[PDB]
Amino acid sequence: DNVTSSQLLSVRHQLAESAGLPRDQHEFVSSQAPQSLRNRYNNLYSHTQRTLDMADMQHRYMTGASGINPGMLPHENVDDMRSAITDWSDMREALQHAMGIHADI
């Protein structure tokens, strides 16, 4: 069977949580980084925002499971979830470096 209801929102909480630069990161990727970096910023997130909506939907008791998409699989959101972090995570180290910092892992 699909993931538990608590997990559905659990995956949307981990995604959206990371799907959002703190502060300094934005000041650079938006006020410094080139358009290519800006347009791509919201792009990867564009898919993350529409994905989380699918997660916190099946919760007929928690969220609004009424007039929603044509019934989607609870595993459809979790999949796209980790996908978004794949782009965001890569940005975490990228943006930090491009901004003007060096890491030593």
PDB file of N, CA and C in Angstrom:
ATOM      1  N   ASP A   1       0.840  -1.227   0.000  1.00  0.00           N
ATOM      2  CA  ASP A   1       0.000   0.000   0.000  1.00  0.00           C
ATOM      3  C   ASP A   1       0.862   1.259   0.000  1.00  0.00           C
ATOM      4  N   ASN A   2       0.227   2.404  -0.227  1.00  0.00           N
ATOM      5  CA  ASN A   2       0.936   3.679  -0.253  1.00  0.00           C
ATOM      6  C   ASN A   2       1.406   4.071   1.142  1.00  0.00           C
ATOM      7  N   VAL A   3       2.164   5.159   1.219  1.00  0.00           N
ATOM      8  CA  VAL A   3       2.674   5.644   2.496  1.00  0.00           C
ATOM      9  C   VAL A   3       1.537   6.126   3.389  1.00  0.00           C
ATOM     10  N   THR A   4       1.759   6.079   4.699  1.00  0.00           N
ATOM     11  CA  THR A   4       0.749   6.507   5.664  1.00  0.00           C
ATOM     12  C   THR A   4       0.345   7.958   5.426  1.00  0.00           C
ATOM     13  N   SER A   5      -0.832   8.328   5.919  1.00  0.00           N
ATOM     14  CA  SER A   5      -1.329   9.691   5.766  1.00  0.00           C
ATOM     15  C   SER A   5      -0.378  10.680   6.430  1.00  0.00           C
ATOM     16  N   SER A   6       0.147  10.297   7.589  1.00  0.00           N
ATOM     17  CA  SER A   6       1.079  11.144   8.322  1.00  0.00           C
ATOM     18  C   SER A   6       2.367  11.329   7.529  1.00  0.00           C
ATOM     19  N   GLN A   7       2.691  10.338   6.704  1.00  0.00           N
ATOM     20  CA  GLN A   7       3.892  10.390   5.883  1.00  0.00           C
ATOM     21  C   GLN A   7       3.678  11.298   4.679  1.00  0.00           C
ATOM     22  N   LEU A   8       2.456  11.296   4.151  1.00  0.00           N
ATOM     23  CA  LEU A   8       2.122  12.133   3.004  1.00  0.00           C
ATOM     24  C   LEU A   8       2.503  13.582   3.286  1.00  0.00           C
ATOM     25  N   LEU A   9       2.092  14.073   4.450  1.00  0.00           N
ATOM     26  CA  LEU A   9       2.406  15.436   4.852  1.00  0.00           C
ATOM     27  C   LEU A   9       3.840  15.520   5.365  1.00  0.00           C
ATOM     28  N   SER A  10       4.367  14.389   5.834  1.00  0.00           N
ATOM     29  CA  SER A  10       5.730  14.340   6.346  1.00  0.00           C
ATOM     30  C   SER A  10       6.733  14.630   5.236  1.00  0.00           C
ATOM     31  N   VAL A  11       6.426  14.164   4.029  1.00  0.00           N
ATOM     32  CA  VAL A  11       7.304  14.378   2.888  1.00  0.00           C
ATOM     33  C   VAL A  11       7.145  15.794   2.336  1.00  0.00           C
ATOM     34  N   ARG A  12       5.940  16.346   2.457  1.00  0.00           N
ATOM     35  CA  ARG A  12       5.673  17.699   1.982  1.00  0.00           C
ATOM     36  C   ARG A  12       6.278  18.724   2.942  1.00  0.00           C
ATOM     37  N   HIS A  13       6.489  18.311   4.189  1.00  0.00           N
ATOM     38  CA  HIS A  13       7.066  19.190   5.199  1.00  0.00           C
ATOM     39  C   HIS A  13       8.581  19.271   5.046  1.00  0.00           C
ATOM     40  N   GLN A  14       9.189  18.165   4.623  1.00  0.00           N
ATOM     41  CA  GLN A  14      10.634  18.113   4.435  1.00  0.00           C
ATOM     42  C   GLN A  14      11.040  18.824   3.147  1.00  0.00           C
ATOM     43  N   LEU A  15      10.178  18.744   2.139  1.00  0.00           N
ATOM     44  CA  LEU A  15      10.442  19.377   0.853  1.00  0.00           C
ATOM     45  C   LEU A  15      10.307  20.893   0.958  1.00  0.00           C
ATOM     46  N   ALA A  16       9.093  21.352   1.246  1.00  0.00           N
ATOM     47  CA  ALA A  16       8.819  22.781   1.374  1.00  0.00           C
ATOM     48  C   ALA A  16       9.790  23.451   2.342  1.00  0.00           C
ATOM     49  N   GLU A  17      10.154  22.735   3.402  1.00  0.00           N
ATOM     50  CA  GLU A  17      11.079  23.265   4.401  1.00  0.00           C
ATOM     51  C   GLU A  17      12.388  23.701   3.749  1.00  0.00           C
ATOM     52  N   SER A  18      12.948  22.826   2.921  1.00  0.00           N
ATOM     53  CA  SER A  18      14.198  23.119   2.231  1.00  0.00           C
ATOM     54  C   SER A  18      13.947  23.989   1.002  1.00  0.00           C
ATOM     55  N   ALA A  19      12.749  23.876   0.436  1.00  0.00           N
ATOM     56  CA  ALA A  19      12.382  24.650  -0.743  1.00  0.00           C
ATOM     57  C   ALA A  19      12.172  26.120  -0.393  1.00  0.00           C
ATOM     58  N   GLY A  20      13.243  26.780   0.036  1.00  0.00           N
ATOM     59  CA  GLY A  20      13.157  28.183   0.395  1.00  0.00           C
ATOM     60  C   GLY A  20      14.442  28.708   1.005  1.00  0.00           C
ATOM     61  N   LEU A  21      15.211  29.452   0.213  1.00  0.00           N
ATOM     62  CA  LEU A  21      16.472  30.016   0.686  1.00  0.00           C
ATOM     63  C   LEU A  21      16.242  30.890   1.920  1.00  0.00           C
ATOM     64  N   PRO A  22      17.162  30.842   2.902  1.00  0.00           N
ATOM     65  CA  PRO A  22      17.036  31.627   4.135  1.00  0.00           C
ATOM     66  C   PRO A  22      16.896  33.129   3.868  1.00  0.00           C
ATOM     67  N   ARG A  23      18.015  33.819   3.654  1.00  0.00           N
ATOM     68  CA  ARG A  23      17.981  35.255   3.396  1.00  0.00           C
ATOM     69  C   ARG A  23      19.119  35.683   2.474  1.00  0.00           C
ATOM     70  N   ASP A  24      20.346  35.608   2.986  1.00  0.00           N
ATOM     71  CA  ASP A  24      21.527  35.994   2.219  1.00  0.00           C
ATOM     72  C   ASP A  24      21.564  35.291   0.865  1.00  0.00           C
ATOM     73  N   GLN A  25      21.129  34.037   0.842  1.00  0.00           N
ATOM     74  CA  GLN A  25      21.115  33.259  -0.389  1.00  0.00           C
ATOM     75  C   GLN A  25      20.254  33.933  -1.452  1.00  0.00           C
ATOM     76  N   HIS A  26      19.122  34.487  -1.029  1.00  0.00           N
ATOM     77  CA  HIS A  26      18.215  35.163  -1.949  1.00  0.00           C
ATOM     78  C   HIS A  26      18.820  36.471  -2.446  1.00  0.00           C
ATOM     79  N   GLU A  27      19.384  37.244  -1.524  1.00  0.00           N
ATOM     80  CA  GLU A  27      19.998  38.524  -1.865  1.00  0.00           C
ATOM     81  C   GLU A  27      21.037  38.362  -2.972  1.00  0.00           C
ATOM     82  N   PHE A  28      21.580  37.156  -3.101  1.00  0.00           N
ATOM     83  CA  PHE A  28      22.586  36.879  -4.120  1.00  0.00           C
ATOM     84  C   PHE A  28      21.942  36.290  -5.375  1.00  0.00           C
ATOM     85  N   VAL A  29      21.264  35.160  -5.211  1.00  0.00           N
ATOM     86  CA  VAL A  29      20.614  34.484  -6.330  1.00  0.00           C
ATOM     87  C   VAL A  29      19.539  35.348  -6.990  1.00  0.00           C
ATOM     88  N   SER A  30      19.147  36.441  -6.340  1.00  0.00           N
ATOM     89  CA  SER A  30      18.115  37.315  -6.892  1.00  0.00           C
ATOM     90  C   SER A  30      18.646  38.719  -7.181  1.00  0.00           C
ATOM     91  N   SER A  31      19.571  39.192  -6.352  1.00  0.00           N
ATOM     92  CA  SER A  31      20.129  40.530  -6.525  1.00  0.00           C
ATOM     93  C   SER A  31      21.536  40.501  -7.126  1.00  0.00           C
ATOM     94  N   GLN A  32      22.134  39.316  -7.220  1.00  0.00           N
ATOM     95  CA  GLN A  32      23.482  39.194  -7.771  1.00  0.00           C
ATOM     96  C   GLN A  32      23.528  38.221  -8.947  1.00  0.00           C
ATOM     97  N   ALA A  33      23.301  36.942  -8.659  1.00  0.00           N
ATOM     98  CA  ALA A  33      23.327  35.895  -9.679  1.00  0.00           C
ATOM     99  C   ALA A  33      22.679  36.349 -10.988  1.00  0.00           C
ATOM    100  N   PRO A  34      23.130  35.786 -12.124  1.00  0.00           N
ATOM    101  CA  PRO A  34      22.600  36.130 -13.448  1.00  0.00           C
ATOM    102  C   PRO A  34      21.180  35.614 -13.662  1.00  0.00           C
ATOM    103  N   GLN A  35      20.482  36.205 -14.631  1.00  0.00           N
ATOM    104  CA  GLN A  35      19.110  35.813 -14.945  1.00  0.00           C
ATOM    105  C   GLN A  35      18.977  34.294 -15.045  1.00  0.00           C
ATOM    106  N   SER A  36      19.968  33.654 -15.658  1.00  0.00           N
ATOM    107  CA  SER A  36      19.960  32.203 -15.815  1.00  0.00           C
ATOM    108  C   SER A  36      19.823  31.514 -14.461  1.00  0.00           C
ATOM    109  N   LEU A  37      20.393  32.132 -13.434  1.00  0.00           N
ATOM    110  CA  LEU A  37      20.335  31.586 -12.085  1.00  0.00           C
ATOM    111  C   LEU A  37      19.022  31.956 -11.404  1.00  0.00           C
ATOM    112  N   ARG A  38      18.460  33.098 -11.792  1.00  0.00           N
ATOM    113  CA  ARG A  38      17.207  33.569 -11.216  1.00  0.00           C
ATOM    114  C   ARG A  38      16.010  32.814 -11.789  1.00  0.00           C
ATOM    115  N   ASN A  39      15.909  32.777 -13.115  1.00  0.00           N
ATOM    116  CA  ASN A  39      14.802  32.090 -13.771  1.00  0.00           C
ATOM    117  C   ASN A  39      14.775  30.611 -13.400  1.00  0.00           C
ATOM    118  N   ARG A  40      15.954  30.014 -13.249  1.00  0.00           N
ATOM    119  CA  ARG A  40      16.049  28.603 -12.891  1.00  0.00           C
ATOM    120  C   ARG A  40      15.675  28.386 -11.425  1.00  0.00           C
ATOM    121  N   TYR A  41      15.844  29.427 -10.613  1.00  0.00           N
ATOM    122  CA  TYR A  41      15.522  29.352  -9.192  1.00  0.00           C
ATOM    123  C   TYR A  41      14.049  29.008  -8.988  1.00  0.00           C
ATOM    124  N   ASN A  42      13.171  29.865  -9.502  1.00  0.00           N
ATOM    125  CA  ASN A  42      11.733  29.659  -9.376  1.00  0.00           C
ATOM    126  C   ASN A  42      11.276  28.445 -10.183  1.00  0.00           C
ATOM    127  N   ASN A  43      12.005  28.138 -11.252  1.00  0.00           N
ATOM    128  CA  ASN A  43      11.669  27.003 -12.106  1.00  0.00           C
ATOM    129  C   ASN A  43      11.594  25.711 -11.299  1.00  0.00           C
ATOM    130  N   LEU A  44      12.735  25.281 -10.768  1.00  0.00           N
ATOM    131  CA  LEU A  44      12.798  24.057  -9.975  1.00  0.00           C
ATOM    132  C   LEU A  44      11.764  24.080  -8.852  1.00  0.00           C
ATOM    133  N   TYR A  45      11.519  25.264  -8.301  1.00  0.00           N
ATOM    134  CA  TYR A  45      10.552  25.412  -7.223  1.00  0.00           C
ATOM    135  C   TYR A  45       9.127  25.316  -7.756  1.00  0.00           C
ATOM    136  N   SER A  46       8.928  25.773  -8.989  1.00  0.00           N
ATOM    137  CA  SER A  46       7.611  25.731  -9.614  1.00  0.00           C
ATOM    138  C   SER A  46       7.037  24.319  -9.559  1.00  0.00           C
ATOM    139  N   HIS A  47       7.910  23.332  -9.733  1.00  0.00           N
ATOM    140  CA  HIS A  47       7.501  21.934  -9.697  1.00  0.00           C
ATOM    141  C   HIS A  47       7.349  21.452  -8.257  1.00  0.00           C
ATOM    142  N   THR A  48       8.119  22.050  -7.351  1.00  0.00           N
ATOM    143  CA  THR A  48       8.068  21.680  -5.941  1.00  0.00           C
ATOM    144  C   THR A  48       6.769  22.154  -5.293  1.00  0.00           C
ATOM    145  N   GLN A  49       6.319  23.342  -5.678  1.00  0.00           N
ATOM    146  CA  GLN A  49       5.092  23.911  -5.130  1.00  0.00           C
ATOM    147  C   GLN A  49       3.870  23.105  -5.561  1.00  0.00           C
ATOM    148  N   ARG A  50       3.809  22.771  -6.845  1.00  0.00           N
ATOM    149  CA  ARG A  50       2.687  22.009  -7.385  1.00  0.00           C
ATOM    150  C   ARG A  50       2.710  20.560  -6.902  1.00  0.00           C
ATOM    151  N   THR A  51       3.879  20.091  -6.474  1.00  0.00           N
ATOM    152  CA  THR A  51       4.018  18.720  -5.997  1.00  0.00           C
ATOM    153  C   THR A  51       3.502  18.575  -4.568  1.00  0.00           C
ATOM    154  N   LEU A  52       3.923  19.481  -3.689  1.00  0.00           N
ATOM    155  CA  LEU A  52       3.498  19.441  -2.292  1.00  0.00           C
ATOM    156  C   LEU A  52       1.975  19.449  -2.184  1.00  0.00           C
ATOM    157  N   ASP A  53       1.325  20.163  -3.098  1.00  0.00           N
ATOM    158  CA  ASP A  53      -0.132  20.251  -3.106  1.00  0.00           C
ATOM    159  C   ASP A  53      -0.759  18.865  -3.209  1.00  0.00           C
ATOM    160  N   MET A  54      -0.091  17.973  -3.934  1.00  0.00           N
ATOM    161  CA  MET A  54      -0.577  16.610  -4.111  1.00  0.00           C
ATOM    162  C   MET A  54      -0.411  15.806  -2.827  1.00  0.00           C
ATOM    163  N   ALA A  55       0.625  16.133  -2.061  1.00  0.00           N
ATOM    164  CA  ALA A  55       0.895  15.444  -0.807  1.00  0.00           C
ATOM    165  C   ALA A  55      -0.193  15.734   0.220  1.00  0.00           C
ATOM    166  N   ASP A  56      -0.334  17.006   0.580  1.00  0.00           N
ATOM    167  CA  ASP A  56      -1.340  17.417   1.553  1.00  0.00           C
ATOM    168  C   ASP A  56      -2.705  17.581   0.891  1.00  0.00           C
ATOM    169  N   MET A  57      -3.183  16.515   0.258  1.00  0.00           N
ATOM    170  CA  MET A  57      -4.478  16.541  -0.414  1.00  0.00           C
ATOM    171  C   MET A  57      -5.333  15.346  -0.002  1.00  0.00           C
ATOM    172  N   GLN A  58      -4.744  14.156  -0.068  1.00  0.00           N
ATOM    173  CA  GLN A  58      -5.449  12.927   0.286  1.00  0.00           C
ATOM    174  C   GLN A  58      -6.008  12.984   1.708  1.00  0.00           C
ATOM    175  N   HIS A  59      -5.433  13.842   2.545  1.00  0.00           N
ATOM    176  CA  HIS A  59      -5.881  13.978   3.929  1.00  0.00           C
ATOM    177  C   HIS A  59      -7.282  14.582   4.000  1.00  0.00           C
ATOM    178  N   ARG A  60      -8.279  13.799   3.600  1.00  0.00           N
ATOM    179  CA  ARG A  60      -9.668  14.252   3.615  1.00  0.00           C
ATOM    180  C   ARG A  60     -10.061  14.809   4.984  1.00  0.00           C
ATOM    181  N   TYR A  61      -9.363  14.370   6.026  1.00  0.00           N
ATOM    182  CA  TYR A  61      -9.655  14.820   7.383  1.00  0.00           C
ATOM    183  C   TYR A  61      -8.848  16.063   7.751  1.00  0.00           C
ATOM    184  N   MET A  62      -7.611  16.133   7.269  1.00  0.00           N
ATOM    185  CA  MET A  62      -6.743  17.269   7.565  1.00  0.00           C
ATOM    186  C   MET A  62      -6.912  18.386   6.540  1.00  0.00           C
ATOM    187  N   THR A  63      -6.706  18.059   5.269  1.00  0.00           N
ATOM    188  CA  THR A  63      -6.827  19.046   4.200  1.00  0.00           C
ATOM    189  C   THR A  63      -8.137  18.874   3.437  1.00  0.00           C
ATOM    190  N   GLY A  64      -8.239  19.546   2.294  1.00  0.00           N
ATOM    191  CA  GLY A  64      -9.441  19.459   1.488  1.00  0.00           C
ATOM    192  C   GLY A  64      -9.337  18.413   0.396  1.00  0.00           C
ATOM    193  N   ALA A  65      -9.882  17.231   0.661  1.00  0.00           N
ATOM    194  CA  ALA A  65      -9.855  16.137  -0.304  1.00  0.00           C
ATOM    195  C   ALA A  65     -11.129  16.108  -1.142  1.00  0.00           C
ATOM    196  N   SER A  66     -11.672  17.287  -1.433  1.00  0.00           N
ATOM    197  CA  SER A  66     -12.893  17.395  -2.222  1.00  0.00           C
ATOM    198  C   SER A  66     -12.568  17.733  -3.681  1.00  0.00           C
ATOM    199  N   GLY A  67     -12.972  18.919  -4.144  1.00  0.00           N
ATOM    200  CA  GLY A  67     -12.705  19.310  -5.516  1.00  0.00           C
ATOM    201  C   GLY A  67     -11.221  19.426  -5.813  1.00  0.00           C
ATOM    202  N   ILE A  68     -10.557  18.282  -5.947  1.00  0.00           N
ATOM    203  CA  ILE A  68      -9.128  18.252  -6.232  1.00  0.00           C
ATOM    204  C   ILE A  68      -8.843  17.501  -7.529  1.00  0.00           C
ATOM    205  N   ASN A  69      -7.561  17.323  -7.839  1.00  0.00           N
ATOM    206  CA  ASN A  69      -7.155  16.618  -9.052  1.00  0.00           C
ATOM    207  C   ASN A  69      -7.933  15.312  -9.215  1.00  0.00           C
ATOM    208  N   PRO A  70      -7.869  14.696 -10.407  1.00  0.00           N
ATOM    209  CA  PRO A  70      -8.577  13.441 -10.694  1.00  0.00           C
ATOM    210  C   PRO A  70      -8.003  12.251  -9.923  1.00  0.00           C
ATOM    211  N   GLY A  71      -7.937  12.377  -8.600  1.00  0.00           N
ATOM    212  CA  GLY A  71      -7.415  11.301  -7.775  1.00  0.00           C
ATOM    213  C   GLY A  71      -6.040  10.832  -8.211  1.00  0.00           C
ATOM    214  N   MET A  72      -5.017  11.225  -7.458  1.00  0.00           N
ATOM    215  CA  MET A  72      -3.646  10.836  -7.769  1.00  0.00           C
ATOM    216  C   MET A  72      -3.103   9.885  -6.708  1.00  0.00           C
ATOM    217  N   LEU A  73      -2.044   9.159  -7.049  1.00  0.00           N
ATOM    218  CA  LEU A  73      -1.438   8.213  -6.119  1.00  0.00           C
ATOM    219  C   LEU A  73      -0.612   8.941  -5.059  1.00  0.00           C
ATOM    220  N   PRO A  74      -0.792   8.582  -3.774  1.00  0.00           N
ATOM    221  CA  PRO A  74      -0.058   9.209  -2.666  1.00  0.00           C
ATOM    222  C   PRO A  74       1.457   9.114  -2.832  1.00  0.00           C
ATOM    223  N   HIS A  75       1.906   8.213  -3.701  1.00  0.00           N
ATOM    224  CA  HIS A  75       3.332   8.029  -3.940  1.00  0.00           C
ATOM    225  C   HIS A  75       3.834   8.941  -5.063  1.00  0.00           C
ATOM    226  N   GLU A  76       2.909   9.600  -5.756  1.00  0.00           N
ATOM    227  CA  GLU A  76       3.270  10.495  -6.850  1.00  0.00           C
ATOM    228  C   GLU A  76       3.928  11.765  -6.320  1.00  0.00           C
ATOM    229  N   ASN A  77       3.485  12.205  -5.148  1.00  0.00           N
ATOM    230  CA  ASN A  77       4.025  13.410  -4.530  1.00  0.00           C
ATOM    231  C   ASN A  77       5.392  13.143  -3.904  1.00  0.00           C
ATOM    232  N   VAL A  78       5.500  12.045  -3.162  1.00  0.00           N
ATOM    233  CA  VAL A  78       6.756  11.686  -2.509  1.00  0.00           C
ATOM    234  C   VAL A  78       7.892  11.565  -3.522  1.00  0.00           C
ATOM    235  N   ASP A  79       7.586  10.996  -4.684  1.00  0.00           N
ATOM    236  CA  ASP A  79       8.585  10.823  -5.734  1.00  0.00           C
ATOM    237  C   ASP A  79       9.122  12.173  -6.196  1.00  0.00           C
ATOM    238  N   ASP A  80       8.222  13.041  -6.643  1.00  0.00           N
ATOM    239  CA  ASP A  80       8.610  14.367  -7.107  1.00  0.00           C
ATOM    240  C   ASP A  80       9.242  15.175  -5.976  1.00  0.00           C
ATOM    241  N   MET A  81       8.919  14.804  -4.739  1.00  0.00           N
ATOM    242  CA  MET A  81       9.450  15.491  -3.567  1.00  0.00           C
ATOM    243  C   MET A  81      10.975  15.457  -3.554  1.00  0.00           C
ATOM    244  N   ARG A  82      11.530  14.260  -3.402  1.00  0.00           N
ATOM    245  CA  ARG A  82      12.977  14.083  -3.372  1.00  0.00           C
ATOM    246  C   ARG A  82      13.619  14.641  -4.637  1.00  0.00           C
ATOM    247  N   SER A  83      12.830  14.738  -5.701  1.00  0.00           N
ATOM    248  CA  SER A  83      13.322  15.263  -6.967  1.00  0.00           C
ATOM    249  C   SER A  83      13.615  16.754  -6.844  1.00  0.00           C
ATOM    250  N   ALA A  84      12.728  17.463  -6.154  1.00  0.00           N
ATOM    251  CA  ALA A  84      12.893  18.895  -5.954  1.00  0.00           C
ATOM    252  C   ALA A  84      14.129  19.180  -5.109  1.00  0.00           C
ATOM    253  N   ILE A  85      14.286  18.431  -4.020  1.00  0.00           N
ATOM    254  CA  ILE A  85      15.434  18.606  -3.142  1.00  0.00           C
ATOM    255  C   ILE A  85      16.734  18.333  -3.895  1.00  0.00           C
ATOM    256  N   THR A  86      16.649  17.515  -4.940  1.00  0.00           N
ATOM    257  CA  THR A  86      17.819  17.193  -5.745  1.00  0.00           C
ATOM    258  C   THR A  86      18.346  18.455  -6.411  1.00  0.00           C
ATOM    259  N   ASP A  87      17.422  19.318  -6.822  1.00  0.00           N
ATOM    260  CA  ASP A  87      17.781  20.578  -7.460  1.00  0.00           C
ATOM    261  C   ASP A  87      18.112  21.629  -6.406  1.00  0.00           C
ATOM    262  N   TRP A  88      17.320  21.650  -5.337  1.00  0.00           N
ATOM    263  CA  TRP A  88      17.524  22.599  -4.249  1.00  0.00           C
ATOM    264  C   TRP A  88      18.824  22.301  -3.512  1.00  0.00           C
ATOM    265  N   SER A  89      19.017  21.035  -3.155  1.00  0.00           N
ATOM    266  CA  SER A  89      20.221  20.611  -2.450  1.00  0.00           C
ATOM    267  C   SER A  89      21.468  21.038  -3.217  1.00  0.00           C
ATOM    268  N   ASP A  90      21.464  20.783  -4.521  1.00  0.00           N
ATOM    269  CA  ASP A  90      22.586  21.146  -5.376  1.00  0.00           C
ATOM    270  C   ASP A  90      22.824  22.652  -5.337  1.00  0.00           C
ATOM    271  N   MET A  91      21.746  23.407  -5.162  1.00  0.00           N
ATOM    272  CA  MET A  91      21.831  24.859  -5.099  1.00  0.00           C
ATOM    273  C   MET A  91      22.429  25.307  -3.771  1.00  0.00           C
ATOM    274  N   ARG A  92      22.098  24.586  -2.705  1.00  0.00           N
ATOM    275  CA  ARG A  92      22.604  24.908  -1.375  1.00  0.00           C
ATOM    276  C   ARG A  92      24.123  25.057  -1.392  1.00  0.00           C
ATOM    277  N   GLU A  93      24.798  24.095  -2.012  1.00  0.00           N
ATOM    278  CA  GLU A  93      26.254  24.118  -2.100  1.00  0.00           C
ATOM    279  C   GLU A  93      26.721  25.041  -3.222  1.00  0.00           C
ATOM    280  N   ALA A  94      25.940  25.100  -4.297  1.00  0.00           N
ATOM    281  CA  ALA A  94      26.276  25.943  -5.440  1.00  0.00           C
ATOM    282  C   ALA A  94      26.154  27.424  -5.092  1.00  0.00           C
ATOM    283  N   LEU A  95      24.952  27.837  -4.700  1.00  0.00           N
ATOM    284  CA  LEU A  95      24.696  29.230  -4.342  1.00  0.00           C
ATOM    285  C   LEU A  95      25.718  29.736  -3.328  1.00  0.00           C
ATOM    286  N   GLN A  96      25.968  28.936  -2.295  1.00  0.00           N
ATOM    287  CA  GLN A  96      26.924  29.308  -1.257  1.00  0.00           C
ATOM    288  C   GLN A  96      28.304  29.567  -1.855  1.00  0.00           C
ATOM    289  N   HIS A  97      28.712  28.705  -2.781  1.00  0.00           N
ATOM    290  CA  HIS A  97      30.011  28.840  -3.430  1.00  0.00           C
ATOM    291  C   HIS A  97      30.031  30.046  -4.363  1.00  0.00           C
ATOM    292  N   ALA A  98      29.046  30.117  -5.252  1.00  0.00           N
ATOM    293  CA  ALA A  98      28.949  31.218  -6.203  1.00  0.00           C
ATOM    294  C   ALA A  98      28.861  32.561  -5.485  1.00  0.00           C
ATOM    295  N   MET A  99      28.177  32.575  -4.346  1.00  0.00           N
ATOM    296  CA  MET A  99      28.019  33.796  -3.564  1.00  0.00           C
ATOM    297  C   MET A  99      29.376  34.378  -3.183  1.00  0.00           C
ATOM    298  N   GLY A 100      30.287  33.511  -2.754  1.00  0.00           N
ATOM    299  CA  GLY A 100      31.613  33.959  -2.369  1.00  0.00           C
ATOM    300  C   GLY A 100      32.152  33.227  -1.154  1.00  0.00           C
ATOM    301  N   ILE A 101      31.882  31.928  -1.075  1.00  0.00           N
ATOM    302  CA  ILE A 101      32.350  31.119   0.044  1.00  0.00           C
ATOM    303  C   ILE A 101      32.951  29.804  -0.441  1.00  0.00           C
ATOM    304  N   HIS A 102      33.788  29.198   0.396  1.00  0.00           N
ATOM    305  CA  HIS A 102      34.430  27.935   0.053  1.00  0.00           C
ATOM    306  C   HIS A 102      34.263  26.916   1.176  1.00  0.00           C
ATOM    307  N   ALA A 103      33.778  25.731   0.825  1.00  0.00           N
ATOM    308  CA  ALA A 103      33.569  24.669   1.802  1.00  0.00           C
ATOM    309  C   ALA A 103      34.694  23.642   1.746  1.00  0.00           C
ATOM    310  N   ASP A 104      34.916  22.953   2.860  1.00  0.00           N
ATOM    311  CA  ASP A 104      35.962  21.940   2.938  1.00  0.00           C
ATOM    312  C   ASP A 104      35.415  20.633   3.499  1.00  0.00           C
ATOM    313  N   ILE A 105      34.789  19.840   2.635  1.00  0.00           N
ATOM    314  CA  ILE A 105      34.219  18.562   3.045  1.00  0.00           C
ATOM    315  C   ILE A 105      35.180  17.414   2.753  1.00  0.00           C
TER     316      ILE A 105
END
